[PDB]
């Protein structure tokens, strides 16, 4: 859905480049359409690690035949909004809990 975290059609490396902007802290995230599985989404998250430094991890959001959405089959959600809320409450396997949506440059006012 056209929610604040939804970036629509966006490639993996472009999502990485945007998330890796200086100023973004760990847990900054976006949701985009998957370019490798049709009908799936990807949750892209800014992360940090002792060895690799600043980095980005991607999690595929797959669709259930009758149910809803999941990254791991043990945690299933009726909507993408419920998935995002869950992973904002607890990381529950993700590299980091979701904090706020990846910022983008807006027109000057």
């Amino acid at each position: 859905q056209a929610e604040e975290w939804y970036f629509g059609k966006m490639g993996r490396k472009d999502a990485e480049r945007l998330l890796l902007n200086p100023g973004n802290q760990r847990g900054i995230f976006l949701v985009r359409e998957s370019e490798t599985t049709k009908g799936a989404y990807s949750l892209s998250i800014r992360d940090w690690d002792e060895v690799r430094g600043d980095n980005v991890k991607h999690y595929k959001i797959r669709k259930l035949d009758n149910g809803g959405y999941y990254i791991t089959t043990r945690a299933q959600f009726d909507t993408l909004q419920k998935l995002v809320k869950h992973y904002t409450e607890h990381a529950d396997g993700l590299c980091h809990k979701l904090t706020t949506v990846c910022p983008t440059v807006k027109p000057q006012t």
């Binding site: 490798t36 060895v51 999690y59 595929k60 043990r74 607890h90 529950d92 396997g93 590299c95």
Partner: protein, 96 residues
């Protein structure tokens, strides 16, 4: 090829801290997701990660005389389509 870790166990234990250990699967693991919480407790579990190169983890700040459920999941790359997958869990219980 195995992605589930095996033979999870506590290998050192004080009243408030545990060292857990397992056998890595044959797939290269990116990181492990570890949870622990009072068995049947009505608070949320604690969660953390360790690097995929490891096969042990230190849990601290436990309450003495509480049964804890401890679970380990491997998060790993399969191929470019399935780039980030969670393994089946392995779990143990331990009373401090």
């Amino acid at each position: 090829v195995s992605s589930v870790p095996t033979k999870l166990e506590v290998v050192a234990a004080t009243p408030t801290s545990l060292l857990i250990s397992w056998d890595a699967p044959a797939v290269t693991v990116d990181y492990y997701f570890i949870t622990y919480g009072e068995t049947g407790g009505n608070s949320p579990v604690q969660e953390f990660t360790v690097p995929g190169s490891k096969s042990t983890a230190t849990i601290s700040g436990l309450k003495p005389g509480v049964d804890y459920t401890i679970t380990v999941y491997a998060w790993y790359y399969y191929d470019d389509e399935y780039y980030m997958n969670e393994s089946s869990p392995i779990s143990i219980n331990y009373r401090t």
